Amino acid sequence: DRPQKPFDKFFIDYIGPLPPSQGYLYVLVVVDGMTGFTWLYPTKAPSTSATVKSLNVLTSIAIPKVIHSDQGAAFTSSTFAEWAKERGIHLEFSTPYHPQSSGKVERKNSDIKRLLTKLLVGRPTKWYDLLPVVQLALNNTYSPVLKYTPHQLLFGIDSNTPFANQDTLDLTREEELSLLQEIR
Amino acid sequence: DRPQKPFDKFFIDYIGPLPPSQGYLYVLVVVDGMTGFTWLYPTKAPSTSATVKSLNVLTSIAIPKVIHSDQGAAFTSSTFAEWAKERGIHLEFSTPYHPQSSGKVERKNSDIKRLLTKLLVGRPTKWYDLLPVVQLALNNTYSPVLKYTPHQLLFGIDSNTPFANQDTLDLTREEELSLLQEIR
Amino acid sequence: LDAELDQLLQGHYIKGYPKQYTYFLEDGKVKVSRPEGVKIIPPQSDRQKIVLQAHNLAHTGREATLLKIANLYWWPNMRKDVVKQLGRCQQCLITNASNKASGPILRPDRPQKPFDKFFIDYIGPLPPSQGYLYVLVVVDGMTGFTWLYPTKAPSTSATVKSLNVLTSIAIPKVIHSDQGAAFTSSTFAEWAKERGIHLEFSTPYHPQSSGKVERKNSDIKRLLTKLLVGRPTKWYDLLPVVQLALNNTYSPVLKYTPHQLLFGIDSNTPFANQDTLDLTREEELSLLQEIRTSLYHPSTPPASSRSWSPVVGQLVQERVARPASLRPRWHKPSTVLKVLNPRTVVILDHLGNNRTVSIDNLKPTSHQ
Amino acid sequence: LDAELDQLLQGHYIKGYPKQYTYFLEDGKVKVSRPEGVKIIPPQSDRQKIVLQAHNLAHTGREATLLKIANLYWWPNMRKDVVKQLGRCQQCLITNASNKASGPILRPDRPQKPFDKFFIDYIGPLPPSQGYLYVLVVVDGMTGFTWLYPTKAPSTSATVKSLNVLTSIAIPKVIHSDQGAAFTSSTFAEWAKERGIHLEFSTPYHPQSSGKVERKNSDIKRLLTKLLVGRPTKWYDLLPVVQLALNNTYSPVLKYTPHQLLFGIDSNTPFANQDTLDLTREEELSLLQEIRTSLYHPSTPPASSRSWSPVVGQLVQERVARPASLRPRWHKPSTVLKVLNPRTVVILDHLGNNRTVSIDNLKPTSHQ
DNA sequence: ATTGTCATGGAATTTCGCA
DNA sequence: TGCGAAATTCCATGACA
DNA sequence: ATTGTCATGGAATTTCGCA
DNA sequence: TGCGAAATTCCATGACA
Numbered sequence A, B: 001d002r003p004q005k006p007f008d009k010f011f012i013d014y015i016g017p018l019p020p021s022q023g024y025l026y027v028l029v030v031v032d033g034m035t036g037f038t039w040l041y042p043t044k045a046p047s048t049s050a051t052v053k054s055l056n057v058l059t060s061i062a063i064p065k066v067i068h069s070d071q072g073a074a075f076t077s078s079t080f081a082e083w084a085k086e087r088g089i090h091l092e093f094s095t096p097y098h099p100q101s102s103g104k105v106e107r108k109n110s111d112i113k114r115l116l117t118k119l120l121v122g123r124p125t126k127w128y129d130l131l132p133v134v135q136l137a138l139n140n141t142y143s144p145v146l147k148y149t150p151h152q153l154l155f156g157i158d159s160n161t162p163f164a165n166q167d168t169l170d171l172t173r174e175e176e177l178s179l180l181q182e183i184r
Numbered sequence C, D: 001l002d003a004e005l006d007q008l009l010q011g012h013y014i015k016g017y018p019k020q021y022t023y024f025l026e027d028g029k030v031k032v033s034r035p036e037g038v039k040i041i042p043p044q045s046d047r048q049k050i051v052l053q054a055h056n057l058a059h060t061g062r063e064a065t066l067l068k069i070a071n072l073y074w075w076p077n078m079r080k081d082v083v084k085q086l087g088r089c090q091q092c093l094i095t096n097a098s099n100k101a102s103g104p105i106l107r108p109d110r111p112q113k114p115f116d117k118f119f120i121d122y123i124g125p126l127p128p129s130q131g132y133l134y135v136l137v138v139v140d141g142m143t144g145f146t147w148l149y150p151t152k153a154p155s156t157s158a159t160v161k162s163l164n165v166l167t168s169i170a171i172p173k174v175i176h177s178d179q180g181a182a183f184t185s186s187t188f189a190e191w192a193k194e195r196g197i198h199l200e201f202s203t204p205y206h207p208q209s210s211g212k213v214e215r216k217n218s219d220i221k222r223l224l225t226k227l228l229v230g231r232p233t234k235w236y237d238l239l240p241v242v243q244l245a246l247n248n249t250y251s252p253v254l255k256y257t258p259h260q261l262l263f264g265i266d267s268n269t270p271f272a273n274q275d276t277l278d279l280t281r282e283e284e285l286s287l288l289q290e291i292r293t294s295l296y297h298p299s300t301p302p303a304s305s306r307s308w309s310p311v312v313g314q315l316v317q318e319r320v321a322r323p324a325s326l327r328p329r330w331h332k333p334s335t336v337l338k339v340l341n342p343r344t345v346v347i348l349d350h351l352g353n354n355r356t357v358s359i360d361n362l363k364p365t366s367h368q
Numbered sequence E, G: 001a002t003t004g005t006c007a008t009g010g011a012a013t014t015t016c017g018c019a
Numbered sequence F, H: 001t002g003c004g005a006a007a008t009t010c011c012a013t014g015a016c017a
């Protein structure tokens, strides 16, 4: 059996709700199952609409042989199931309650969640504008398992904005101060 | 002494008043002293203005070494005398009351006067519109003294509208009927 | 369906399926190992369906299109089928622009005498001077002698007013014009019939044809712009001086001014040329007929490496009027009825009336 | 006054007044019988006054001008004085157009990797679709991969909004643009400083320079017009499909789609190219660096029979902005300070600031 | 201070299939 | 070692405000 | 059924002045 | 039968909506 490639599979779930930024409440997260390259589309709800609205974007760049996702409302819906059939895209599903990404993906998705909450604390409401910059990061985040970032595996070259800031990302001591006082 | 040429001399007098056609009352008459080619400019009065208005036209085509004319108001006036000096044009004058055109010119001028009155009887008032057609005629009027019309002597070719209608032009029998009843 | 491909897989050769290739089946498809890898070989029943599929992705031309196909399928004489489909793609045919240039231009003969042919165009609109707005420029063909008339519009109305002063001097045989609104009026035909003047027209949308004047326009606009530097554009008043100016100015290549070509003697202008002072008019006038005839006259240029000239009954297309944006820059194809000369043809469109047009607004229809 | 001409008439020869001509006086003027007839010979004190007189009749160039003079006067080295006066005629210098073509164009090197250089132009305006009106087209230099963004204006405002989505994927080093209103804003410089993006600009009024995109615009407008035949121009909705379309389409001459040049693998598009199925990404990715570098790259054409290239400190003139009508089509002369390359120079005008411009909008100033 | 591009479809060339 | 036909490559033409 | 033109200023050529 | 410099002629470039 043949080697693994970018575009061979695309992993999606939705993140949210969250404190509204320019009236978005959700982030659609797509990670390339080979390179772990990430796309982040901010949406208004986990609806098959706002999904397809976004993917129509991404897919104007590249189309994935396969889309793996949990069994959410939006991804099962027959509407999405068509959009896929149309685009010649095989849909693929994580048996309810036993969700199965992959090493690299499982990881990258974790990296993401912590990453958001890290910076949307202190500006819980100014996060829409940082989606660009976040992406740039998790795509120039040097992966232990290869010598390579998404960016380099995707394009085969070095980015012009490297995050050789191997940075904490963890809820560093002070952000729990005005964190568990904003909710607790 | 050298031979005679078109443009060497330009003969002018004014004809009028006459029954108004589109509000003109006068015809300025210029005849080339060599070819006897004729130009007809209809004017509003024998004033140095309306003269120069016209000649400014003619002279945008060709400029005469000399302009011969009687001693009329308009041709003596220092204004005209300048316009001439400007254009480098020598002015030249027929000693009062003894007016001296030339064979060909004397003639052509006669030809003209009869010609007008011939056709501005019966439409004494529609004559402005015929100035074009009149010219065409007296410029394709085969001259006894050479084998040639103005048109041919001027341009050295044959016109595309010939008046090989050697026509009467004389106040033919009937036009004295409604002629000396319109004034007599 | 199956048809031809059985005998192939069976082993005993078929036309245009070169032998040393191992034509097997696999995945329920008639693959074949070729030097580029293995390519599928679809049944002739599907090939039209495919090539269209491929092309229609981005309405790509021949190479662009085959290269997409190449990736997956293979079969005999490929491009042939691709070309079939391209010459059938209506949209490709009315949008792609040419790559074939028109054959070399014609240099018609200088009209023989003055007043044989008059050219006329309208320049404008311009900067209101004295409420005037356009100019009517009239160039005599043979001589290049030129008349200007400043007008408020480019109207049959004022076009006539002017030539009525012009035809005072003489009457011309023909008048050439752009098929512009003011020369194609019904009213103008009458004006010209009346005087026995044949009206002849540039093909439409092609001023090369009326260009004796288009070129006299350049030279006119040029000289005003010189006379109105650091002065407001009050051009009305120069029209006279300009007119005079040009008619009395040497064309280096002939060594005569339009004025002289038309009269044989300079008037009392500056640097009036003396030479013929001493011959009678007669002697002058005959020498004129001499010069006039023996006047430089340019030949036809060489054709371009890749030009075309127009056969009869050929498929060709007319350039779109003033196309809108996002609208094909070419009309649907049409057939060349008569060829009036290597640069002018008569065509019938699918409309379908007869039209006379410059090869310059035609593209031969690619592919046949 | 008299000066030189005495010794002439006296008999004993003078420089440049060839002997076998009988230089007499008559009519109180220093005539001379030459083969063309007798010509006057004005005193050097009057010659400037004359040549000007002659020229100024119709601001005629060299030959045209001498030929008027020839009629009456003669003297030594004639045209020399005529040329002096022409190079002094301010109006001739700012209106006559050139007769000297620009030296051959430069084919700069294909940027090395993707994201080294991005080109960007705005297409528009267009037919309102969904209230959108322009497009922002962004072509990666190296790869030709291309992004479209439909916008309501050609504004710094919406120019930014878009690249903020773009620079999500990656950030480019340089961005090339037309000096258009939206890219020269102060606000945009800040946008790009912020991200560490060097802004570099086409010389003004010269899209050949931004032309990697100008050419990607042609190909875009082209494909919509095909997709919107016999359908209202509702283009907004195709922008996606088009974008996808082109990035995934072979350039015949490279044999790669912009998509592949940028990724090394077709996505799950139609006729996705198979070939590298079997190498690990690693193996692919290295072969990519291989292809990418060994990509066709065009050379410079031959220069035209009569082109010019630009020396330093030369006298040259910039083409007029959008000239009005009856307004010189050239600015007053100026001096070539630095030559950035045979097609781009820096000039100082009489204003006089420094400007960087394409030789294409320059004419060398005739006569020196 | 920066700079032309490149799809297209006939033609001209080179390479393929078979001997 | 050489043919005829196909496949490929060449490259002038034109259009991007 | 109709159709390119032609001034311009450096270059390349031809002709002039003198021997 | 020949030189150097001037005079002439050549002709690619561009612009007429």
Ligand SMILES: O=C(NCc1ccc(F)cc1)c1c(O)n(O)c(=O)c2ccccc12
Pocket: C121, C122, C178, C180, C207, C208, C211, C214, H016, H017
């Ligand atoms: O485009 C025109 N003239 C410029 C031109 C271009 C190429 C040439 F070889 C000769 C001239 C038009 C023009 O001169 N006239 O008179 C028109 O009536 C006209 C009408 C519609 C479009 C263009 C022109």
Ligand SMILES: O=C(NCc1ccc(F)cc1)c1c(O)n(O)c(=O)c2ccccc12
Pocket: D121, D122, D178, D180, D207, D208, D211, D214, F016, F017
């Ligand atoms: O003229 C323009 N584009 C067409 C073109 C012409 C010749 C080429 F080689 C390349 C392209 C302009 C253009 O594309 N853009 O983007 C502009 O901003 C512009 C502004 C003013 C005038 C023209 C253009």
Ligand SMILES: [Mg+2]
Pocket: C121, C122, C123, C178, C180
């Ligand atoms: Mg016109």
Ligand SMILES: [Mg+2]
Pocket: D121, D122, D123, D178, D180
């Ligand atoms: Mg632009």
Ligand SMILES: [N+]
Pocket: C107, C108, C109
């Ligand atoms: N002809």
Ligand SMILES: [N+]
Pocket: D107, D108, D109
């Ligand atoms: N370069």
Ligand SMILES: [Zn+2]
Pocket: C055, C059, C060, C089, C090, C091, C092, C093, D226
């Ligand atoms: Zn098509």
Ligand SMILES: [Zn+2]
Pocket: C226, D055, D059, D060, D089, D090, D091, D092, D093
């Ligand atoms: Zn001047």
